[PDB]
Amino acid sequence: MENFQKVEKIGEGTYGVVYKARNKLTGEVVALKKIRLDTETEGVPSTAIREISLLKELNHPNIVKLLDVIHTENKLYLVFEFLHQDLKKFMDASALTGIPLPLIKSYLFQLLQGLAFCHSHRVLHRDLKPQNLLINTEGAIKLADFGLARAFGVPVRTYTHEVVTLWYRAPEILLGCKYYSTAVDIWSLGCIFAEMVTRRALFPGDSEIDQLFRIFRTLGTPDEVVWPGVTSMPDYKPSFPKWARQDFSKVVPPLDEDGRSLLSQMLHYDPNKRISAKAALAHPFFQDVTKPVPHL
Amino acid sequence: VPDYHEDIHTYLREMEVKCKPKVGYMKKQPDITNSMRAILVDWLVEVGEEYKLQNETLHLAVNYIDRFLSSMSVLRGKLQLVGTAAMLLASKFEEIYPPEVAEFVYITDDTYTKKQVLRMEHLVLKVLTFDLAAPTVNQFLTQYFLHQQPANCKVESLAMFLGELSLIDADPYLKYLPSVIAGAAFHLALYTVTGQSWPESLIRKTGYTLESLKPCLMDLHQTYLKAPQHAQQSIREKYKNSKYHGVSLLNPPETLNL
Ligand SMILES: N=C1NC(=O)/C(=C/c2ccc(-c3ccc(S(N)(=O)=O)cc3)o2)S1
Secondary structure, rough: OEEEEEEEEOOOOOOEEEEEEOOOOOOOOOEEEEEEEOOOOOOHHHHHHHHHHHHHOOOOOOOOEEEEEEEOEEEEEEEEEOOEEEHHEEEEEEEEOOOOOOEEEEEEEEHHHHHHHHHHEEEEEEOOOOHHHEOOOOEEEEEEEOOOOOOOOOOOOOOOOOOOOHHHHHHHOOOOOOOOOOOOHHHHHHHHHHHHHOOOOOOOOOOOOHHHHHHHHHHHHOOOOOOOOHHHOOOOOOOOOOOOOOOOOOOOOOOOOHHHHHHHOOOOOOOOOOOHHHHHHOOOOOOOOOOOOOOO | OOOOHHHHHHHHHHHHHOOOOOOHHHHOOOOOOOOHHHHHHHHHHHHHHHOOOOOOHHHHHHHHHHEEEEEEEOOHHEEEHHHHOOOOOOOHHHHHOOOOOOHHHHHOOOOOOOOOOOOOOOHHHOOOOOOOOOHHHHHHHHHHHHOOOOOOOOHHHHHHHHHHHHOOOHHOOOOOOOOHHHHHHHHHHHHHHOOOOOOOOHHHHHHOOHHHHHHHHHHHHHHHHOOOOOOOOOOHHHHHHHHHOOOOOOOOOOOOOO
């Protein structure tokens, strides 16, 4: 553990502190997750078992690279490639002008590729949110934080319900469905897509029911026509207020017809109808995609 | 049919070759033997039942065990310990509510301390270099089941049963990849129940002909005939329950005709 000079706290993760650090010997800049063991209760958290073991499989340029695991007596450190900052801080710093459209298109393309690789390697990320997306100076964005990820089966079976950060959580999880798969990650990306366009979180609720209503109020309250089976889901209530679906050019004004189309496909109530990461890359919204450099 | 079915399958075929224990590992183990491993795995079954764990966890455990023993010498008194930290790491990886460490201490009848299981957990991790997302006979079985005309549940449970027998006997089964054993278990179930054979769709999907599955069928057939005489019976007793449609009570076919 002694080749590293820690520079500062950079982040919190869902399961441990992250630092910027440098290799005294190679000069290499890195990020260090500290995962706290404290020894005699439960040992190494399932959280870390999953993250390390999935991340080792998931080598792709749109996924953070795990360089090393320092597996001490008292602590576990995951050593990652250092990336300049998160999409979150990038968005906050771009609130008044907004991120250039060609940059959004690029970030979305790149993210979709990262997600495609994940899903094709049987992994759900389950915590796609802007402070988990990492951006460098050369125009790249990478999925990070796999502490909440898992390997899914074909077919799936019931997974953990306490899943995905509220603002980004898909309706099928909100409404208490038995089964969810890859579509939960697409929904999250949809919200993120929208956030880059509007500079405001799309569905910023403060409780499960508040979240539900924020989705309903924008996309229309779901019914059997739009989502066969909604009305018989465990946490569906006939007493949910019935709001009309708002027009996309009001929801997400700066988008052209192609962006709206793609967004509407990512944000479909029916997980079975929701577009896949792989199919999305074929979307005509990406016919003219480039690699712009972020105005840091 | 799910969105990434073909893709995931191709990928598991790449991974099953990387997640391999060396075949003749038991030959270089000074103190433990195949029949001991057999006692161990059998026990792990008993444990999965008691704690209502997924069959996939059992399979992950066995894979960790075979990989760990492939590179560490283990004395008989420590064998259970390796299996216990395997099972515990399989649980943590694959289950929603893994049992707690105190529950793993408990079913060793207090042979080992909590302090130990946690140290063994650490070591097992160290030895497998944190590589736990291993393909199992089980993953391929489910994947194969989707190509079923139509969904016979008896065939399913029986294939699951046959694949689970494969876990107990390192000789011969370590010879085979999970996909191959899966293929074998599937055709053998299908036949036994309905007379039908390993279908055209899977031949296209896996590249596997009845002819390439033959050596494994030959062995798996044997195992299946000798199943009630076998020293370890935990699987037979498990697959007697209604949950599994009592498939372990069906009569194997006399010949496989191939
Ligand atoms: N939750 C996480 N999971 C990871 O793998 C992480 C690795 C990582 C690399 C770089 C960063 C990183 C995170 C946040 C910033 S920030 N607060 O925008 O300056 C800057 C860099 O995190 S963070």
